[PDB]
Amino acid sequence: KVFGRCELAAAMKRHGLDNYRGYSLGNWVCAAKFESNFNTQATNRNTDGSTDYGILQINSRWWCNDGRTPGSRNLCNIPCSALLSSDITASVNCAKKIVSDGNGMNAWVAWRNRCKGTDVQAWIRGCRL
Numbered sequence: 001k002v003f004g005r006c007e008l009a010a011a012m013k014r015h016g017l018d019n020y021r022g023y024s025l026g027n028w029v030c031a032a033k034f035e036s037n038f039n040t041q042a043t044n045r046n047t048d049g050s051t052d053y054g055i056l057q058i059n060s061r062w063w064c065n066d067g068r069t070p071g072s073r074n075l076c077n078i079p080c081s082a083l084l085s086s087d088i089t090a091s092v093n094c095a096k097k098i099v100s101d102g103n104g105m106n107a108w109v110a111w112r113n114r115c116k117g118t119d120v121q122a123w124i125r126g127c128r129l
């Protein structure tokens with residue numbers, strides 16, 4: 001599923017991401033835009049052998065199990081393929097764990113390099129939320 005911008009904003013807000021760990025909704029929408037282009041099916045391999053999965057590009061070295069990432073944790077206790085569903089529930093629940101783990105949203109490289117410090121409220125412009 002390729003979410004619309006406001007469509008994703010509303011789903012993220014319903015699941016309690018708006019202001020989760022102090023990160024406003026626009027931060028999460030911006031992160032998803034630059035991580036996955038709003039595409040729940042997005043997958044990208046990393047140089048360390050791990051892969052990033054789904055709308056928020058959750059990594060198989062720490063957070064989900066894909067069976068092919070040696071010496072990896074599965075801290076969200078979920079198969080990585082479950083993070084590709086059109087329903088974002090599993091990605092959101094896992095993202096809540098990630099953002100609580102110490103570094104905040106700096107866990108998302110695209111957030112750090114493209115959203116952090118910018119006018120993220122623009123990502124929810126026009127949305128009825």
Ligand SMILES: CC(=O)N[C@@H]1[C@@H](O)[C@H](O[C@@H]2O[C@H](CO)[C@@H](O[C@@H]3O[C@H](CO)[C@@H](O)[C@H](O)[C@H]3NC(C)=O)[C@H](O)[C@H]2NC(C)=O)[C@@H](CO)O[C@H]1O
Nearest residue numbers: 052056057058059060061062063098101102103107108109
């Ligand atoms: C969205 C996503 O999957 N992002 C991935 C990052 O999570 C990952 O970065 C590493 O994440 C781990 C787990 O959060 C970091 O470990 C934590 O580090 C802090 C101190 O900085 C400490 O308080 C925590 O206890 C510790 N958690 C543990 C050990 O479970 C680790 O520092 C991150 N590493 C780096 C280089 O940022 C990166 C890299 O694997 O991948 C993203 O896709």
Ligand SMILES: [Cl-]
Nearest residue numbers: 024025026121
């Ligand atoms: Cl915002």
Ligand SMILES: [Cl-]
Nearest residue numbers: 043044045051
């Ligand atoms: Cl891939």
Ligand SMILES: [Cl-]
Nearest residue numbers: 021103104105
């Ligand atoms: Cl923080």
